[PDB]
Amino acid sequence: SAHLQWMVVRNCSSFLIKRNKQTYSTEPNNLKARNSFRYNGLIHRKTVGVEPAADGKGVVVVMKRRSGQRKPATSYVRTTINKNARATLSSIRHMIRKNKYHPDLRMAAIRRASAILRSQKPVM
Amino acid sequence: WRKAASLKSNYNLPMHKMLNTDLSRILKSPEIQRALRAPRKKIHRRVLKKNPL
Amino acid sequence: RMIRKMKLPGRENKTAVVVGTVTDDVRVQEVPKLKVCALRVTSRARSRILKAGGKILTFDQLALDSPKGRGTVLLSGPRKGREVYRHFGKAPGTPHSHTKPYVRSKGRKFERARGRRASRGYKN
Amino acid sequence: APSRNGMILKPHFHKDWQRRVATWFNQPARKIRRRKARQARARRIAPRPAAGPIRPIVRCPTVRYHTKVRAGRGFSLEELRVAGIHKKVARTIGISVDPRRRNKSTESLQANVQRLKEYRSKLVLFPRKPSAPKKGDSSAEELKLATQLTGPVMPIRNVFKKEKARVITEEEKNFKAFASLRMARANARLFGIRAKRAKEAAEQDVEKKK
Amino acid sequence: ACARPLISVYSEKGESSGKNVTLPAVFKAPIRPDIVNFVHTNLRKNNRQPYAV
Amino acid sequence: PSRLRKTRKLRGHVSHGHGRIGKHRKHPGGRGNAGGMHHHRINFDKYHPGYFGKVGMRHYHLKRNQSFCPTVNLDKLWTLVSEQTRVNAAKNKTGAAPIIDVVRSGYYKVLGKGKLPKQPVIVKAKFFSRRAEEKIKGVGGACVLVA
RNA sequence: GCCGUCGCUGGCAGUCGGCAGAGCGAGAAAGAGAGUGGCGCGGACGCUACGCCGCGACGAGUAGGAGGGCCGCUGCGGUG
RNA sequence: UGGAAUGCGAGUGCCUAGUGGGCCACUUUUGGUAAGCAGAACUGGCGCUGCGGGAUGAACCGAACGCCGGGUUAAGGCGCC
RNA sequence: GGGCCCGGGGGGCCACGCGUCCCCCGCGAGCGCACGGGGUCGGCGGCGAUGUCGGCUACCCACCCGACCCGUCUUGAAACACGGACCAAGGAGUCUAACACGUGCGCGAGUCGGGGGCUACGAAAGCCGCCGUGGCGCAAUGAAGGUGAAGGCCGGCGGCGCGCCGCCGGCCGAGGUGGGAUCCCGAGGCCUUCCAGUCCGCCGAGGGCGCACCACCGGCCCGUCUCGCCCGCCGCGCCGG
RNA sequence: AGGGCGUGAAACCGUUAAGAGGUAAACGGGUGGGGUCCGCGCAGUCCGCCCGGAGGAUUCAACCCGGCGGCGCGGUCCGGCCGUGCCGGCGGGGCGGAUCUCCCGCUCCCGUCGGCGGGGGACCGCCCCCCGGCCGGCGACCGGCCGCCGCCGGGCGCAUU
RNA sequence: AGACCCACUCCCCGGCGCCGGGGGGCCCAAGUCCUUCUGAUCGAGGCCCAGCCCGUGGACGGUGUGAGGCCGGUAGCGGCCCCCGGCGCGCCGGGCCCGGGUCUUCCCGGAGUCGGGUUGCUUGGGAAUGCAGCCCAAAGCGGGUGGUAAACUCCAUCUAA
């Protein structure tokens, strides 16, 4: 279970960074890189990840399917979205709220998405 | 659990102290949720005392 | 001990609850149908309870069955049933003190001459 | 100095015990060496059993252990004599011999005599000259099946004669276990003095008679 | 803590060979990171060699 | 481990936790159990009454195998045989009682603590207590002596 | 005002959202109960629960005790 | 009508270090011509304790201490220092 | 003076529907200002690229108040008490055994293979089960010989004279008093137009079963003492219970 | 790195620069002045929505095709594995048992009759595998259809979006 | 030892010839490929689908960093060559002329030692565990031991010098 698995990794994980009175998690599908039960991207049956696309245009939304929990090969569904800024966010909001897929990560996913799109604009 | 080890003279799997580790399913279940008092989530910060006189 | 305390009048169909281990008692002949919740149950105690038709719970199952603990009989093992408490109290060399002394050996030669019989100095 | 309640301790460290500490860091290397000498010995005497000569049954002394049997040093001359095995020929064919041991009772004697006869029935004996068999030697067919034996030969085991449930009689129900024991202790304790009193009594009255 | 699904057996070509094995009970045993650390801590001391001046 | 011990926390504190006045001297009071009848008399009398003196006969060359006599109470008597032994006897009708041989289980004397189930049994042992035999006889059993 | 300690063995799993309805600080027991008859698709942060939040009191220290150090040093198993 | 007032949550068990040179003051007090002498009772202190005052000072008087701003005090003071 | 400042013949009221009976004689809507659950301005000004702006701390210097040199033994150290000229590196509660208590883990009336054996890291790890011998625990007590851990009720007989003891068969059964977390029942009670009476909950006088633990009183086992009457038998005893 | 040569500390010393100097020096608190440097300053922030001007496009919604995913009390869809579930089995077997019991090796006795030791079999407890029936999970454990929703790719929409 | 039965031909010694663990030596995979940093590099990037090549060899060391592939090595029931050994098979000359059961008659043991006294040391060994000096000094169904001195008496158990 998530709670059992969190009790194994809360303070012992290759993704755990403790430094400068801070703590981060570098595993995939953690929306805030936060060593938190909520935002851990491995222990839950349903997780949401947002990454920049392979080329610096658009984001990739990763969703964990329900069936293959023990089958890493086919557990994550990756969708690339390369619309305008307001349309990219609208899709993520619907991908989470309409499906009721981890609704508590809605704004974290939207906030992370806005940060990737912003970083893909030309630097000044 | 049903069958003791065959290649160890006397051994069986260690018993579980907690059968259902899904703490979120337990807490959100109807049975527990009927026994709880309503949450008290209002925050009462300190009141600056003004002199009535 | 659990069978005795669950046999008192008016404790029928009540789930015995102990925060600890339920050990088997070979001196018991007939094991009545019990419902029990414990942290641990020894391998032989488990077979006897079930073979009598009883039910063994964990504490995560007591919550889903008795969220407030209703219909429960909380029970505890003998706290003073330990060898140490035989050594606590008035020091062994004081009047009417039945405290157990700390001896490396037990026998005629080991702390029985003077102070323990009037024929040798004194007794108290 | 003693401090409140505590055991009184007498450690035996008033000599130069550090000059004579025996560490055990060679234990695994000893275990390997002992095993390697068991293997090279098993190869050396094959097909003879690796364990060694067959040992007899014996009852452990004292009242603490006489309910148990174990492997003794070697079969006794009375046992070998009753089993028709020459004592000097016994060691040559895997049988151990103990000239010291005495047979006090028949049943123990018989048990080892039968143990010998069973062993002689399992013995596969290779002829002295392989091409020239002789009278007692095993046939060539059963020499192709002769394989070395692992573990003690005919291991000795403590077997219990199970008794089934039977209806209790009135004679047994009436028996008094405690009284019988207490009276038996008294009789074996006052036997010598009672016999003395009887002797003196006869003397006292005889002088009155004569 | 009672589910024993079927585990695929894969061919050397990396594909499911169609065969299956029920998940052994040992994979449902309690996960105790502190029993492990106790046992690892004390067993790893057993292959040491002595050092002394 | 030495990292969890007082010495690490006592770095920088003069006296290392033994005081400035009394200091830590070599052997004040004597070595070992010195002073039992002297400056250490209260501790010995208070906590070890009987320590000094002699009591009882000497016995040279004691052999503890001669007095070997493990005991079992009646409340544990039926554990020496399997469970089906008891249930079969309790439910059979011919009245046949099973034989419990306590010597085979490694006991010599049978003691009386506890109560027996209402079930006839034949008990074999080297020794019995008086109350053991009565309790064994109260359920319809018999006591059998072995040498 | 701020730091820490102690206490309240205080509060938060209720993030219960369009399969929706936001409360339970309030002088004074126990249900914001259940019934049967007489346009938009939207709503901040949180929760390393070993975490976060609130309120009140307090804070001298040798000998000595205890706790915590994301204080520091050398080597070993993992990991980065 | 929990049978006076007032205040306060109590009880209990293990393991336990350092100490076992003390000294001072009001009052009482033994020896001594007396002593910043020797010896007691009670309480409070110094020892372990800074801080305002007694110019200075182990103990006197006031008051006991987290790092700060404002206000007011104590004992003591307000010619100049 | 007190009696909602009793009753009768200009100035402030946290008086303001009514049917009535009669003592006496359950929702109006808005809007707004604020001495109202801890500060805002929906108020402004000057200066600014080569000499000027900010930089707590930090380097040097100055001034005012404060300020005796540390470690140590000591009632008391700045002491005319001892160590210390300066700098680097080294430098002092460790390891083994035993014991006690506390804590953590495993199993649990058991538990432990530590010795032995089997089968690069590995001298590790894994296995033994007729390898658990053995240790500790499960039984105490006495110098020892030794002994060694609940009872009552019903019916019959025997001895003494309704009761007592000895002996036989059937029934129940590991004590009780006080306190005691928790648990249990439930008088009454928890509202919405109004009446009835239901389902689930919830508070509760009173009453119960009572964990651990403590205090007290009984009981049981071993040693010893006092009194006293019996029961057993292959051994009739200086016997045994 | 120049033959006792890797690095090259501290004490202590020479010199250069700056500052200062009659109550030995040093020190705490508080400012002040001066320096060394740092801001890699010197017309001063950034973000969302909205209004308006200039423009400019892989042009929006809605529809169709395909793929993927979430959920479904599909009020009770089919197929599945599947219950540390319960019932019925001529079910085919392993493990254990201080529950009972025709065959054999050795031995006492006359060719007979008994004891030890060695084997079937029955029985009971547990377990695994096979078949039928109820309820049962699939949230440590899934597939196919249908439905709803969401997302993406491709068409079409060509402009008060 | 004698008698009656029963059964026996291989066991070794000195020489001589033939046949299947140990020591020493020599050897056995694969990049110095293409760009590139450097004083020099073993560094960094690359080496098609596939994934530079070997790999039973990715221990280690050397070489101008830091190297599985440059060298030595490492792996391998790998190869070759010498020597010692062992285990077997034959011949010559030798030695032994060998055994078991039952009856009959015979024979059988360690002395200045044991044991005893006393002394000193020693031990857990206590009216004396062991050892030694001096004195006494044996026996032959005897002697020693049987953890409290001693007498009488049975047992058990060994057979010292």
Ligand SMILES: [Mg+2]
């Ligand atoms: Mg002490």
Ligand SMILES: [Mg+2]
């Ligand atoms: Mg201190």
Ligand SMILES: [Mg+2]
């Ligand atoms: Mg000191």
Ligand SMILES: [Mg+2]
């Ligand atoms: Mg200390």
Ligand SMILES: [Mg+2]
């Ligand atoms: Mg001291």
Ligand SMILES: [Mg+2]
């Ligand atoms: Mg010491």
Ligand SMILES: [Mg+2]
């Ligand atoms: Mg403090």
Ligand SMILES: [Mg+2]
């Ligand atoms: Mg002193």
Ligand SMILES: [Mg+2]
């Ligand atoms: Mg004085």
Ligand SMILES: [Mg+2]
């Ligand atoms: Mg004085």
Ligand SMILES: [Mg+2]
């Ligand atoms: Mg002091």
Ligand SMILES: [Mg+2]
């Ligand atoms: Mg104080």
Ligand SMILES: [Mg+2]
């Ligand atoms: Mg003070």
Ligand SMILES: [Mg+2]
């Ligand atoms: Mg003055």
Ligand SMILES: [Mg+2]
């Ligand atoms: Mg102030």
Ligand SMILES: [Mg+2]
């Ligand atoms: Mg002044």
